[PDB]
Paper text:
Here structural analysis of hydroxyketoacid aldolase from [name] [name] ([name]) revealed a dynamic movement of the metal cofactor between two coordination spheres without protein scaffold rearrangements. Holo‐[name] forms a trimer of homodimers, in which each monomer adopts an (α/β)8 triosephosphate isomerase (TIM) barrel fold. In total, holo‐[name] contains six equivalent active sites; each of which is formed from amino acids from two different domain‐swapped dimers. The transition from M2+ R to M2+ A,S is induced by bidentate substrate binding and occurs without a concomitant rearrangement of the protein scaffold.
Notably, mutagenesis at position S116 reduced the expression yield of soluble protein by more than 10‐fold down to ≈3 mg L−1 of expression medium. Identical orientations of the alanine/serine residues were observed, and the protein fold was unaffected by the mutation (rmsd=0.115 Å between 230 Cα atoms). Surprisingly, no significant difference was observed between the wild‐type and S116 A variants of [name] upon holoenzyme formation with MgCl2, as the thermal stability of all variants increased by ≈7 °C. This suggests that the thermal unfolding of [name] is not initiated by the dissociation of the trimer of the domain‐swapped dimers. For the [name] mutant, a lower apparent K d (i.e. higher affinity) toward M2+ A,S was observed with Mg2+, while the affinity remained mostly unaffected when Mn2+ was used.
Author numbering:
A (entry chain A), B (entry chain B), C (entry chain A), D (entry chain B), E (entry chain A), F (entry chain B): 1 to 251
């Protein structure tokens, strides 16, 4: 079973890890914490395909669903990640219904999409009866990061093969001419985020959001977000190190 | 100049980072914080020589001294790390004066040691005037983590080519038949640590210590330790993630 | 000389290896067996560009032509593989004449295509007179894996710069609403495969096919297929290991 | 639980995989077959520490015990592999009781050995209750592949911290001035192998053996060997490929 | 400050290194020579994303601007390189105003482009006030390598978000039906190169050029080219080795 | 055949490449030049075992003998390099007859040495008739770079399983209390080098030498040295780049 789809099917949200550092050790350790999934960022990180492959194995062993935020919404890139046992896909900068159809096409075998058949690691997980439940094993979220995406939210949500949307708040803030701050209080950005959540739920589709703090994630969970990521390993490591230095130097 | 030797020459201690995760991004980010050095652990980590090499470049760029805790006190292993721009060496499990001489021999060119000549990255850092100050550019600490090392402390300190010692408290606790707790305060281990510190200062040599928390490091700095490491990137990242999950799932 | 083009020019087919495992050791060992080429799969494998590069060197040394089944029909991806000494290109999911023109454009220098000039490893193989015979050194096959590709077979074969087609039977079976089994007996799939072979030969172009067994490859060779791949290293290794376990446990 | 120690505690032998190819995909696939352990060869392979680390994760996920045949009986090499989640250690060329004590010392924490404390991946597997069962979680076998080792068999078996011995027949044949044939049945080598097995069982210690075929492994299991490895991934892949080519090129 | 933009703002050209070999050692050594930038070639090289990442760190430490000649003009590929601290982008085979707009869009944050926000290594270099000067920190050159690009030079130069053009002479020679020789004397190619330079300067935009020799670079600098690359590490290493062999064998 | 042993058996010396940069491209290109061997330096370089493995494949394909200067004279390190197709071994810092016996033991199968059997890549090169000529296929040189080694030269040369010695002049200069200059001509060092050469030839054993220039190599070849290395790839690349910059920035 997909542990994020299990959470949803039991009427409960998913809390996810977010990794911008390559390596299997921190991936496994965070996966063993009370996270339902761990997302590997391949957009804003030095993580190439060579480095994601063993991190997906580490997350699965830790007992969380391996998710990937891809570099770009490219069909063949996403297919190769699925065949390496990425059981969740978050595609950045999905601005139109066609781009959302491009995402959906890659996540599903024919007749439902055009996904190429060679499921190396999924066939090892789910066995010979993988084809019949292949779509159920994978989670697909289109990212809302632009005024265009926000304007096209209704038509993006109408695409069948995506489970719903994942808001990128910093990029959404920036495109609306505001500060690209994580967990922004900016009234227009908060209003847009709330609007995207309501339309998603109105369409019978899931809504997720990127968070930079535990306190902000708690509010988003209380607001009824289905998928909540908190926080980037680098940001948490940087903050903890600064705090350790402060305590050590009596600052 | 060696920023740890600069700290010492201005009669003040060095605060160091400690890395068990491979990769250049967190190495650079931590190096840019108020650390004087960053130690890469090659004993209790998945970091091979292939992975340490670019991490040393990242630490130097961040503006901290690249240090390495080696797998073992092996002359040729240490020489290859120096030639890749490791400007500090912490050798584990140094139990005798001969093992401490084995360490010293690797850190210095002839006549002072038997270090092989090919300083690829040090010649790029220090230029044509590297040979004249080569010993000054490198810091060498023998690890005390056994009853044998503790018994042989005076003869270890008498070796000319080491700057002094680096206590491993958890391993020292374990060898004395106590619980290997991070920041252990078992009276026998505290007594041994205090003894090692006083003999080091009595011998006109530096003393350092591994810490798993900022609070413990502050005490060790206040106790007059010259080199204090706090804390492992993995431990800080794991603790921060647990705290972020706790805050997110809180009522 | 291109050993697959040598086979064809002597009126004889090519038997090829198929690799989904990264590493140079098995690549060399299989290359030294009675294979004319060895295909590296970059679609349904964990093999990134970093890992293909030395595998191409290993195959060439073993005395087989390095072939690559790419992730996708992308011009620049294919050009970079040619410049790393991939002397055969199999492009997946080529469904139209335009996509087949996209393939051809990447395999040929101007005026014949738009291939960028910097032939790092081919210039080392073929020397200063490489430009004059550059097209002859490379083999290009468009993959037929869809009802669209099957319907457009005539217009795909009419493209000048491709040597012909390579059938992907599992994907072709799946898109026709049948089981994605290697070496399928499904009458409609067998009929389509036979149809694609006849049109290819009628057009004076080569036809190849993916096989999962030696027995099936023998039939395809007897059917007059020019390029026959048998079998995936993973599938052969998995089957052999199961058989070794069975013999060991007296099953 | 250690699945090899589970086999032994239920009075029955362990069948193990043997890997000379680097990569996580074949490691996982073989681990999912009816093997109790999978040994990664770091002596007679291109597998460095960088490449073994993620292979140990893949084997554990597949549901077999990660074992390692090390390059050499080096304490610090073995400790670093344990801390990366190698739960079995086969040390080559153990010829004396002192070399066997050198092995034992590395596999156990103080008081029983001198193993350095930092169990990164074992603490993630076994949790907070790891230290209490740490020795139980690890399996240690000294390799017998010399006339010296064969002569010193009784004194090697008398060492407390090793579970027993692992025979290398080809190297044992070669050192006795015979042909280094896989699954050798040279009467002198068979006599020595039989002698080593009886002395091991007489000493209340385990005996294992390297096999290059399923048929030979079945005999060794029937001869009462506790740990049987069959066969090297490369050898099985090479043999299968030769057979597939033979069937394809047959009349 | 961007050291190439510093050169330009002081009314002076930039001399750049050009690297087709992966690794950090030669990158640092060349960066410490009298080069203003060092370009890493990702088109005509075995250098994947995994291998560029630490080379960018090495170049920055050496005290030259990290530049990248990308595989292709792909928005998301370029964004990921910027976020890994590539502070110059040379995009190959830019033939139209739209392709040049595609380049510009990737180099600038909203409203000026559509660059995704997550500046991992640039935020570490330039700090919290990076957003305000983000565009000034990056240099963007569209490559002129085709008759199409040459014909569209005016419309390419009119695009706001590119600093100007970088001529690829070998590809330009080849597309004009001449020999693909570095530093060609071919009158038509020299005429076209001179024409492209004049139109660039007439448009108030920068012009750069690839050179295979120091003598040719001196002429291009004297001709008023703003960005001059000389020469490929492989070509310089190959020539030097041939000369060393000649001197050694008395040839 | 071993191309260095072929040179010697035809009563003539061997010219060798020397590589401190990792990667397969420059290794192949230099191997295709008029070098008999190419030595990979694993002592004074960032090249780990992971990176040497594919470089040995590249050198063999180029048509030169893959040699390795190891980190240290360690039996098991040398055996693993032989099994990865290193057909020449230069062991640093061999100071005694016992250390030279330690080298010899690793290069030969029983009865002649104690080399462990698993010749992965040599069995692929030389086929089924490898064992009969295994010692003939490998070249072994003990390095003389200390006053101890120089004093023990006669007893080092008396060891049967080494082909002879390889002088490290810079390290020999340094140990004798002189400047470690490339191609040093300090009278004491020249005297020692001359002494080592005459004793080697008197003992019916080969003598080799490290050179940093083609001119110096020509003299050493004229002095009757059997194996001459010239020059390090880094040194040649750095010198060529400096010269290209000088010519470019010239008036
Ligand atoms: Mg975003
Ligand atoms: Mg297919
Ligand atoms: Mg070009």
């Amino acid at each position: 079973h997909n542990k994020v789809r299990t959470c949803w099917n039991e009427g409960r949200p998913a809390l996810a890890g977010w990794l911008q550092l390559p390596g299997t050790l921190h991936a496994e350790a965070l996966a063993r914490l009370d996270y339902d999934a761990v997302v590997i960022d391949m957009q804003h990180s030095p993580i190439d395909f060579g480095q994601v492959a063993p991190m997906l194995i580490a997350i699965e062993l830790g007992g969380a669903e391996p998710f990937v935020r891809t570099q770009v919404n490219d069909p063949s890139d996403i297919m190769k990640l699925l065949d390496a046992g990425a059981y969740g896909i978050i595609a950045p900068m999905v601005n139109t219904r066609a781009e959302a159809q491009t995402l959906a096409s890659a996540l599903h075998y024919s007749p439902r999409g055009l996904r190429a058949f060679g499921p190396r690691r999924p066939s090892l997980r789910y066995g010979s009866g993988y084809l019949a439940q292949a779509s159920e094993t994978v989670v697909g979220l289109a990212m809302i990061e632009t005024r265009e995406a926000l304007a096209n939210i209704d038509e993006i949500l109408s695409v069948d093969g995506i489970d719903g949307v994942f808001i990128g708040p910093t990029d959404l803030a920036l495109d609306l001419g505001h500060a690209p701050l994580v967990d922004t209080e900016e009234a227009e950005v908060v209003s847009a985020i709330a609007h995207v959540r309501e339309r998603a739920h109105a369409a019978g589709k899931r809504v997720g959001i990127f968070c930079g703090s535990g306190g902000f994630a708690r509010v988003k969970l209380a607001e009824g977000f289905d998928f909540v990521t908190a926080a980037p390993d680098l940001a948490m490591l940087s903050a903890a190190a600064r705090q350790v230095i402060a305590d050590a130097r009596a600052l």
